[PDB]
């Protein structure tokens, strides 16, 4: 596929979201699903369009598989690549660290020469702080199954539609 989606998950939510995103894009012929846990950093080189999925754990911390591969990221060719992000978080229980993981990954990967695409509005959420917010918008799709599970489907639908234009589909 032209789009490589790499996700990490602890309790499975981010994987379900990744599968739904793949489905919304048109399936396996359009998006390849890859669990970062089973990947080498070089695996990301095979795609020119990437989607990075990661839930926030601990207190504003990276999901462990992403945490473990983080230091290998700078060896990857992200030069000029369009990268989109999504994450699972809990805005009620972690209002000061909502979606921090996605923010941490985007800060790192964008500093490696990539172009972030897929910005998302913060208005549909209620939180205090997030490392995933740059000038009043999320750097990617924020999903919250803990507090807003009923909004997930339409958010993915809307975001993928937005991404298609931003990627070139
Ligand atoms: C112990 C614990 C810590 C968490 N820490 C955060 C956090 O700092 N920020 C946040 O947005 N969500 C936080 N969450 C919420 C998770 O990101 C959320 O439950 C998500 O659905 C987990 O996704 P996963 O199943 O892909 O691992 C935490 C949840 C638990 C149970």
From Swiss-Prot:
Name of the gene this protein is made from: isiB
Domain annotation Flavodoxin-like: ranges: 3-164
Similarity remark: Belongs to the flavodoxin family.
Keyword hit for Transport: yes
Source species, domain of life: Bacteria
Task performed by this protein: Low-potential electron donor to a number of redox enzymes.
Entry's induction text: By iron stress.
Keyword Flavoprotein: yes
Family annotation (PANTHER family): FLAVODOXIN 1 (PTHR42809:SF1), FLAVODOXIN 2 (PTHR42809)
The protein, known as: Flavodoxin
GO molecular function ontology, one term from the record: FMN binding
